[PDB]
Amino acid sequence: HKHAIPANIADRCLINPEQYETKYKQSINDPDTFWGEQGKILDWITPYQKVKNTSFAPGNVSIKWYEDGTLNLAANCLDRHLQENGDRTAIIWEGDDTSQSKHISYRELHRDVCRFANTLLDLGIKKGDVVAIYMPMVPEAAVAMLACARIGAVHSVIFGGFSPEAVAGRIIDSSSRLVITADEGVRAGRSIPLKKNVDDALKNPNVTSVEHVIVLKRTGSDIDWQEGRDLWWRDLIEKASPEHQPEAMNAEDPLFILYTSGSTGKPKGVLHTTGGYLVYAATTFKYVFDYHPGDIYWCTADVGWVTGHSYLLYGPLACGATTLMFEGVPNWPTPARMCQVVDKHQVNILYTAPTAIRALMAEGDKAIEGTDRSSLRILGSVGEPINPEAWEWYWKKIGKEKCPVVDTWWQTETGGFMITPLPGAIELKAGSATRPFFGVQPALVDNEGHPQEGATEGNLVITDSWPGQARTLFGDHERFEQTYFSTFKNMYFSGDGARRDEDGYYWITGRVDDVLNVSGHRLGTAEIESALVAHPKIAEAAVVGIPHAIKGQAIYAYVTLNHGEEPSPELYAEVRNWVRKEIGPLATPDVLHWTDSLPKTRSGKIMRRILRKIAAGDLGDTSTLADPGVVEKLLEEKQA
Ligand SMILES: Nc1ncnc2c1ncn2[C@@H]1O[C@@H]2COP(=O)(O)O[C@H]2[C@H]1O
Ligand SMILES: [Mg+2]
16 A cells, blocks of 8 residues: 655756656665765855765775765854744744744854854863763753854753763763753753763762763752853853854865664764765655645654754754754653644644654543644654554654655764655655655665665664764774674675565565564663672573563563572662663663573574563574473573
8 A cells, every 4th residue: 555645846846757767766876976066055165076985895994985085063053044934933942831932043053053053162162172962952062063063062961851860871981071061951841960960970089070060950959069160051151242153164174973772782983974964864854744835843852862863953954944943752741742843833743753643642642632733744753663553543643644744764883864765756665764865875685795686674784874864883983883884794784674565666574683662762781780790699691672662662671690599679670770770761661570490592692583482472493402301491591
C-alpha cells in the first residue's frame, strides 16, 4: 500500500519525482558539481574551489568538504536574514506551562547572540575552546550554541537528564573551559536540579578545566553559589555590547562535539565541522520538510541530541524558518498538549518521535480531543524505528490523512537525513524510510561484507562520503576508524540493519550492534554493564534490550552479586538508582534479574544473544557456551 502524493503538496513542492530522480543521479555521478552548486544555499565569506575530498581507506580515513571555503554559521543563521526578515519570528518558545510563551525575532535573537558572543570573549573563551552546555529547552540554550558557533568556540551540549557523573565525564574528555546551565529546568510541572548537578560534577578531582559556570535564573530556586566561579546569565549579558562582527571560520573548523554511546566502551565525542555540516543540515531541512517562507516548523527533539542541533536549530535558522522550541512534554498537563501547541501556534510542519507517537496513541482520541490540527501540512518521524500501526495512527489522527509523513533515517555521525521520503517526490509506505537523500549511496552487505542486490536484507552501509558526515571522534581518530570503517572495508558501517524491498525502498529494522534505543535515547550495552559492575555488591552484569510497546526497547539487566549478598527490595532499589547515578534516569534498568548463571564462551566472554531471547520471553545454538546448563536455569528464574 503506497500512499499517493496529494495534490496540495504536488502544487507547492520544491522537488517533484522527476526532479528527485535527476538530482539524485547527479549527486551520485558527479558530487563535485552537485554539491558545488547546492553549497550556495549558504553565504560564504570566501568561496570554496575543491568540493569533495574524501577517503574511506582502511586505517586512513580522511573527510574534507568545501575545504578552502570560509564562512560563519551564526551569520548564516542570523545576520543574513536581518535586512529582509529581521522582524520575522526566529524562535517561538512555548513553556511547560501554557500561560508562558515568547516570540523571538531574527533581530532580537541576533542581538542576544552578539551580546553573548561578547560575553564569551570577555571571559577569555577563544576559537577552538570547548564550552559545555547543560541547559533545559529555553531560548538561551540556542543563544549559547549560536554564540559559540559565532566565535569559533566548540560547543558540547550535554542532555539535561544526564547525572553529575555523566556530566563530569564529558567535561573531562573535552577539557571544557566553561559550563553554561540553569538553576533548574521545568518539565511536566516538575523541577530538575541542573546547577546542583553541575556543582556535584565539578567536585570530581579529575575535572580541572572549568573556570566558570554561567547560570540562567529559570526558577529562582535556592542554589549553592561559588563566588568568582559562578556568574548569572542576566548580569553578564546585560553588560555586553550588542555589536559583534562575525569572523570567518574555515569549512573544516570544528563546530561541535556531541558525546555519543557506542556498542562498546564509554561515550565518545562525535565531531562535526562547519561547512559541509551546515550545507547538509540546511539542504535536508529545506527539501525534506518542503520549507516555504512563512511555514511554522516544530521539531520536538531536545537540544541535547543531534536532532536538536540539526533540525531544531541550525537547519531551520539557516533557511530563515520560524522554529518552535517547546519546554515540556507532549502529554502534560493532558494527552492533548502536543496538538494544543500545534493549534496555538498554527504549526505547519510537525517533526516528532515514535516514542511520543506511541505514548499519545495509547491515550487514543484523548490525544486529539478538542483540537483542530488543520494548520498541519507535513509530518515527520525521527530517531527510532516506527512500526506501520503507529505510522498509520500518526498519519490519520494527527495529520487527518492529508499530510505526508517523512520517516527520516540518519545518525549522530551522519549530521543530517540519509534515507527519507521527500513529500512531493516519493510515494509513502507506512514504516519505511524509503529512498536515499541526494549524495547518499546505501548498500546492504552480509556479515562478510558482500553486497546483497535486489530485494534483500543485511547490514546498512554507506559507500561514499556526504557533506554532513562526522569527521572524527574527539581525541580518538583511530577509534573512529575502528568503529565505523573497519568492519566492512572502504565503507561507513552504520551499526543498523535494514531490508530493501522489490521497489527499492529501505526498511530500517534496528541496531545490529550492541547499541540500545530506549525512548529515542541511544545507549551502550557495555556502558550500562560497566555502570552496574562499579557497584560494590555487584560481581557481573549482562544488559539486553527487550521490546517495549511505548519505549521501543526497555533495559533488562542480568546481575550477579558478590559472595555474601542477597537480593532484597532495598538492593533492587539501590542498584536501579545506582545506574540512575552513574549515567542518568534515561538509562535506568526496567528489569533486574538476579542470577549466578551468566552464559559464557570457553574463553570467558559473555554471550548475550540467548539472554536477549530469554528476556524477551521466548532458542539458539549453545555449543559456544562453556556450560549449556545455564540456559535452563535462566529459563526458570525468568518464569518466577
Ligand atoms: N527513522 C528511523 N528508523 C529506524 N532507526 C532510526 C531512525 N532514525 C534513527 N534511527 C536509529 O536510531 C539511532 C538513535 O541514535 P542516532 O541518531 O545516533 O542513530 C540512530 C539510528 O541508528
Ligand atoms: Mg563491583
